[PDB]
Amino acid sequence: GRCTKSIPPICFPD
């Protein structure tokens, strides 16, 4: 449930 800001940024199942 958290994403990075990773270009494009990548999101995780967390």
DSSP 1-14: -EE----S--EE--
Which amino acid makes up residue 6?
A: S
In angstroms, the Cα distances linking 8 to 4, 5, 11, 14 are: 9, 8, 10, 18
Token pair belonging to 8:
């494009």
Tracing tokens 């990075």 back to the chain, one arrives at 4
Whole-number Å distance between alpha carbons of 1 and 7: 18
Whole-number Å distance between alpha carbons of 6 and 12: 11
Tracing tokens 């958290």 back to the chain, one arrives at 2
In angstroms, the Cα distances linking 9 to 12, 13, 14 are: 10, 14, 15
Token pair belonging to 4:
């990075």
In our burial notation (b when 16+ CB lie closer than 10 A, e otherwise), range 1-14 reads eeeeeeeeeeeeee
Whole-number Å distance between alpha carbons of 10 and 4: 6
